[PDB]
Amino acid sequence: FVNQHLCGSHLVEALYLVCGERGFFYTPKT
Amino acid sequence: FVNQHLCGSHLVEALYLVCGERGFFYTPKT
Amino acid sequence: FVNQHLCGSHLVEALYLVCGERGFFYTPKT
Amino acid sequence: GIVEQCCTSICSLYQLENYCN
Amino acid sequence: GIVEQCCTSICSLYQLENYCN
Amino acid sequence: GIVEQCCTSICSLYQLENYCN
Amino acid sequence: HLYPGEVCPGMDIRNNLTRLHELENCSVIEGHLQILLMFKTRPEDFRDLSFPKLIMITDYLLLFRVYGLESLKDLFPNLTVIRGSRLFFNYALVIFEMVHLKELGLYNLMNITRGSVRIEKNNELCYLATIDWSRILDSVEDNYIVLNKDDNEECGDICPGTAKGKTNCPATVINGQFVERCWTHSHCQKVCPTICKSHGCTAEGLCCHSECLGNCSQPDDPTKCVACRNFYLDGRCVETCPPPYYHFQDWRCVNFSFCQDLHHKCKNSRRQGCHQYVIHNNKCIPECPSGYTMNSSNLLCTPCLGPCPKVCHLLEGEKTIDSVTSAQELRGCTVINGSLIINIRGGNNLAAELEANLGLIEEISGYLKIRRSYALVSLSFFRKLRLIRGETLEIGNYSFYALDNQNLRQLWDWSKHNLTITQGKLFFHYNPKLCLSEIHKMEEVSGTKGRQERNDIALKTNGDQASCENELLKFSYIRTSFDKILLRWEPYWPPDFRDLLGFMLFYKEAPYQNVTEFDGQDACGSNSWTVVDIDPPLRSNDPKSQNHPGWLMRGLKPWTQYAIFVKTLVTFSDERRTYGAKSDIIYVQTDATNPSVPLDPISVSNSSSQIILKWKPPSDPNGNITHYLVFWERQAEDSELFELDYCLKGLKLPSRTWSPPFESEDSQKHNQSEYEDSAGECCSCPKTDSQILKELEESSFRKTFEDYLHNVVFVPRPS
Amino acid sequence: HLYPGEVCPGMDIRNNLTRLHELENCSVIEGHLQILLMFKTRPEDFRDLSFPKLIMITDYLLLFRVYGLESLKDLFPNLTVIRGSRLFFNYALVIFEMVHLKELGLYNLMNITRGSVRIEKNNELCYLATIDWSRILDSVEDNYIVLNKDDNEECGDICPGTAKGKTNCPATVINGQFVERCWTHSHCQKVCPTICKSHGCTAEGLCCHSECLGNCSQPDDPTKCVACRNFYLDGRCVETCPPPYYHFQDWRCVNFSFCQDLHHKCKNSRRQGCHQYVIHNNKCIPECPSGYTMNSSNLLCTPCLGPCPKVCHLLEGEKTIDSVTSAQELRGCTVINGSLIINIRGGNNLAAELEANLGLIEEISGYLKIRRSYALVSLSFFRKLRLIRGETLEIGNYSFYALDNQNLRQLWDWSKHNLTITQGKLFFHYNPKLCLSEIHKMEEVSGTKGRQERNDIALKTNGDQASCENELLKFSYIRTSFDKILLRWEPYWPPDFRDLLGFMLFYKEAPYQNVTEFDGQDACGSNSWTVVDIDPPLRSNDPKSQNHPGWLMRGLKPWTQYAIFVKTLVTFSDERRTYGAKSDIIYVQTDATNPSVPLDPISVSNSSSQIILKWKPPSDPNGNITHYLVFWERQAEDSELFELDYCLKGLKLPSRTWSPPFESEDSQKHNQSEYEDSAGECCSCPKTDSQILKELEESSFRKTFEDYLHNVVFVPRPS
Amino acid sequence: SLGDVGNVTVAVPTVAAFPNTSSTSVPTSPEEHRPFEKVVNKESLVISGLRHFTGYRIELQACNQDTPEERCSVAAYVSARTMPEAKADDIVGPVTHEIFENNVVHLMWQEPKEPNGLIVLYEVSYRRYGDEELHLCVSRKHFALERGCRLRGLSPGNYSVRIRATSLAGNGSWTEPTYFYVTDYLDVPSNIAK
Amino acid sequence: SLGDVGNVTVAVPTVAAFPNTSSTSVPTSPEEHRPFEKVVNKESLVISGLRHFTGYRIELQACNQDTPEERCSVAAYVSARTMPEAKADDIVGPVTHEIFENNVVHLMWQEPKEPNGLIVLYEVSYRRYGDEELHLCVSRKHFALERGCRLRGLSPGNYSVRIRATSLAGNGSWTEPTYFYVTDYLDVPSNIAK
């Protein structure tokens, strides 16, 4: 993220903060 | 020592060594 | 053989373990 | 996986904003 | 705790920081 | 051939087998 | 109806509130149920509904990163069992990274069908240690409830001892600890008799009957009981359903029309696709086992003539089976078109499940890779493996990449076991308990002899603590004393008799019989290892005598089950083959005598007329036989009496004192302080090097006269 | 000169039955016939030997490790004089460490003007009780005639005068009477008087000329002497040699060509010993000791100012040193132009002597085959070892070779040393327990690439127990005390924020300021260094943390310097690029603090009103000290002293310097209140019963859990 | 324990290699006539035939021979002090003494019935204005030699005796702190003990 | 009690409120300026101004940071006894006697502070001639409370004394059993140049 190499729960928390609410998607039609 | 445990008043000699003048409010149990 | 204190009573056993079918020397030989 | 772009070689903006709004 | 996290457990300054930081 | 010790010295069968009276 | 209908398939609950409307009036789940990423939500936010409608879950239940929902007593209070057909990783219940918890619901659960539980990284929930979970599970080990707030010193997991309502907290022993069977504080969980629990019981002081496994709704009834032990039809438990209703997902009895329609549909929003189920002997199942092919006449499984195995398509894209869930991804397949990698570690020998899933495929395409197995023994899930195509191998042409298989001291039993190597070589490094003479046999039966590399791969790196040798020795004479024994074994040597260098006896105090070779890896106590070389007078068998090859122990403990096995010191040829021998790993002990004082002769006298004693074994065992005789030498008129006359001031070490110490918790306490200041001992002491080689060379003075006479004297010389 | 027969020097005899039959013409022996390595010589073959006659014997005699020799009485008949010119252990005769010398020659000895006779370990030896005692030995006090068969009063002293023959047997006087003294069973001794023992006596007349000795043709002429105690030359005798002729032990003069130019001609093409024989101490010697160099064109050793180095050219240019004394053999030789192979077996930390000796041995011009260096774990203890040439190439055209060597884990450090490579390739392989980048630094300092191949040296293994950590760390903060010291360092983590699992602190007592980096042998607690682990830190926020990685250490004594550092708990993988770091060894001095307590308090005095107190420090060298607080004001005027020890009691208080009011003894040595400070690490187990991998098995397992828990919940679409 | 120095049983209870008799007759066995103590499913066994308020050594050894009692005639040694009770911490004999109000007395605390190892001691310091004075230290050697004490000037009255508390494991006869009278020996006045 | 000055070994006399004043004869005080010495880079310091074989407890301590106070180390209690002057045990101060009215000459031993070191006892071996008057080989407490020494009765004629002052040095008023002339049970000129 900030060092271009992040690996941990901090990655998920930062990713959630990047998008915010209604940020995650997925694909049921597969 | 710190090998397995320190038990006694010596914790005080460690306790003040941890905080320093920063608005410390350590709780020495004796 | 590693140099232990193989003398003394051990000598009797050293005199016995290769014998017994041919008697054995009771006392030390030293 | 996300690790495949962030637990490895450089993790840039596109490697993160792949599913945000 | 304050007198059971280092005496009655493996010592670690992380919990000790909580009593003044 | 007058060796008596075998802990601080050495010996062999032919020195001991005779002494099995 | 007894079991409510309205079955609701599972879905993903992610990132928003008010998504629980798909739980309204739902009986059971058909799929996966996940609750993910509910951050910064009040307890009141998710308490808008509660679902005791749910009874059991077909598959794993997942809870990950949810900060509201302080307990499960107000969303899923009433639940009984969790099906374990499908698994996620070692279990079905995931509770990971919960916050603001202080209680736990799930009132009166009975049994988890397969796996374990997981409640981890939850430093907020308390009262989560003595919960009734053990008997509910099948795998008593492989449990994971750690990073709680009781080992972290933030709350004590206390539960009430009294009968909380109909429930009660019997102190049940698990692994030696008394757990109060409960779910949280101010509540309890009942326990029934073992025979009753074999088929479940009601929470009414009553026991169910057979055909059931949990709580019987109409109590003590076999036909109308909830949580059936077997299949069910229209609200009645059934062991087997006569036609037309066949079994489905191993737990329901459904109509033939339902299975046909399901085959005529797919659950990926398409048609004539996924979820291809067909009839078997009693059950609708997908992908009929080997020896039974499809039947388009009526869309069934029918018995094919000859083998008709089913191959799992893995041509491109690596799919390693490194978990029980990944093992279940390939059920009943016969060929792995891709490469297989095994990295499973820990557990309690989960290979049994591999025997239930694997151990049926016989062609391993590409390359096998058994890497980093910290705990894996008794490989028996590749017995049928006797073929390999080698479609695409790894770098270095090493299609058998075995590495870090610490306790993997067996491969097969060699009952027609074999494997044909079309292409590739064998890699072996760091295999302490993998044998040499069996690896060579495996090499011989796979065309690897000769083409094995002797520039990248060696063998001596392995076998560092145990091995096997088809060459064997026997104990031809034994004479027993109390502290030493004269043992003599067979005079056998390898085919190159003059390559003989000498024998090597390895002895240690193995704790009990039926334990394999360990010496070589252990260098301290707990298999304290000792080794001594041996070279008796006979080097060739031509001169007969009354003393065949043998050795005597330099000294051992009386009546100790020392383990004896041997490995001959030998050279090695160009290409390594079966070389070296041994004898039977025999547990032997000497005679006994007890001149040594039993340790801790604690004065525990309690009567003036009679003497109470406390005996622990001496440092030597001095015989496991418990028969002793007790006498005593008098001590009257001793010089200590009249010299240490204490009839006045001044310490004289006064005569006739009695003060037992009681080392445990009364004097010399144990707060994990090891050293005693009476006389300390070094820990990081100095160290020197090995020095034994100065000693054996002395004996060469009495074994070299004939050598010089045969090698130095008989030289043709001009003098 | 002017002698008959062959004037034969001496040579050794070895490992055969008899090699005296070759002698049929030597009538004069100038050397000394030595016996060596005769471990199996039987007596029966020595009953007859060959020697024509004897004019005189010049050098000493030394007999050593012979099993036979029932008769050595045929070698030296017609004896005239014997003396130890050279002296092995200062004695003319040395019988030591042999057995059963029943009979010998020497039966007409006339005088030994210098050197006594020592006899030892002769179970069989006769007729040493009926021989002249003081007429033959110049130093009677140093006579050691002991352990002989006749000396045990068991061998009948049969001799001539009763039943044997006549061999010119005059009756000499030692005890007033003219005794018919003898030497052996059938021989008699001719002995000159003690009065003129320094001039010689002959049957032809009175005592010979003063320059003569032993025997002469006629007296009053130096020319007529057959043996001169003064320098003999060309027939005549003289007191000193001319400068053209160098001296030889008061007995001969020899032209300089036989000392100077005799050995300079040959470097490797003469089997006599080419050591550049020089002249010093008025005598010709192969080489002179240290402190005496070569300056003249003739190569005569002359003194130099103080001790000076020696450039030694050894025979064959090869010397395999197999012991500390095998290296002391070449002591003083500061530069050696050849191979110095190390195959040293045994010993215990005596290699400090090598640091005095091999720490001066700079160059090894030959192939460097070194192994079995048990004593020195690290090769960084030689202050002069820089040059390694390949003038002699072993097999493989290599100038260096250390393959599959054990009991080594380190090499020479370049922080305070260096080394250079020359003459071709070099092979270094299979010495585990040592990092590999150190060899890369060796290549860098050596230079001259092309002959430093990165395929002929280990860059593939032998380092999977000491990870080469590229990065290094420091101590950003260190807040110390008497023992409690909090060290806090940089919060740098690896790119993965879970692979690092703590920090391994390394420390030991090291007042010195020069230390290598190693770890002694492993015995579950015993190690030269001391090592412990520290829990990993906790993340707080992305840009920076508010809690640095810190650790509190105890046990270190104040005032004392410790060569302490840290390493990172690195999870093993296939790439060392992303591993952690290690701090540099800092000789950190624990601050001078009040628990400094000197020991060995000794009260001595030259008077009663003085007490010159002296002591030794436990760990306080007083470097930072300012003053000593000491008490002499009265603090023993205690009521205990004024109110104790009535004379009615036994004498116990006299001869004491310890009384109640001065007591500070512990109430109980058991750990009760504050004696728990000695709670240290496990010394039965190293730290924990389970070795390291079982922890790593857990650690990585959690990662493979969490990432497996992540890889299913992300990546909604490839697009 | 050993009735004979050899390795046989003589069945002679009158001889036990000690002045006192502790062994009793048993059937003849191939070992010394000794107090055999068999062991079956326990790690503790009593030793009867001792004297009260005493501590003793203990012999122990296990040997193969079980058809006889035991062939072995040696053993390993431990120690154990008996637990005192309310039977010998008091005077095993009476606490009476010989009364004399006739210018002289013989003082003798009676010896134990079973000889103990340590009596409850009472100090003796009866001093006056510089006249014939008696002292006494009470040990086995000292009590045997000095034979108690003998005073002069005997009449009903006060008698000085040193005072100190006694505590071994709870005694049964002690020294009192009172100004001692002589009221015809209830327990304390004439005889300080009890 | 009495603060002192100086940071090196003392040699001048210290006021002790006695006629003969010697240094290191004062009770300790909270003042840190003791007779100690500073570092000389060596673990050896000759000490002067002391008394001839006076008993001295010392707490050996090193120090650092002399600027604020004598910041020093913890105490290790060691007692010093070096080079007894048994010659000086004869007399430092004079000796006299009070002839008590009991046929005893209570010998009073005067001193400025020390008859050759610290008085701890005066060994006496005079208990012969049966039982006689109240004899005390007087200890230091009874010496404090009486300022002398008691003995058994003494008759006219010759009497060999056995009183030697024991300051752990010996030879005070006695070296061998010389006979003094006891005249009329009194008037014994003891310590005849002894």
Numbering used by the authors:
A (entry chain F), B (entry chain L), C (entry chain J): 1 to 30
D (entry chain E), E (entry chain K), F (entry chain I): 1 to 21
G (entry chain A), H (entry chain C): 1 to 719
I (entry chain B), J (entry chain D): 724 to 917
Q: What wording appears in the published article?
A:
The insulin receptor (IR) signaling system is a key regulator of metabolism and cellular growth. The IR is an extensively glycosylated disulfide-linked (αβ)2 homodimer with a modular domain structure. Each protomer consists of an extracellular ligand-binding α subunit and the membrane-spanning β subunit, which also harbors the intracellular kinase domain. Insulin binding to the ECD concomitantly elevates the receptor’s intrinsic tyrosine kinase activity before cellular signal transduction.
We then decided to reevaluate our cryo-EM dataset, which led to the identification of a second, minor 3D class with a potentially distinct ligand binding site occupancy (“intermediate state”). This small, but stable, 3D class of particles captures a distinct conformation of the receptor with at least two insulins bound to sites 1 and 2′, with the membrane proximal FnIII-3 domains remaining converged. The reconstruction is not as highly resolved compared with the four-insulin–bound state (5-Å global resolution estimate according to the 0.143 FSC cutoff criterion) and comprises merely 1.7% of the initial particles. Surprisingly, however, the domains in the receptor head lacking insulin are strikingly tilted. An additional density proximal to site 2 is consistent with a bound insulin in both size and shape, but is insufficiently resolved to exclude it being portions of the receptor (e.g., αCT peptide). As such, we cautiously assign the “intermediate state” reconstruction as a two- or three-insulin–bound structural intermediate. This second 3D reconstruction provides evidence that even at the saturating insulin concentration used here, the receptor adopts various liganded states. Furthermore, our intermediate state map demonstrates that a change in occupancy is concomitant with a conformational change.
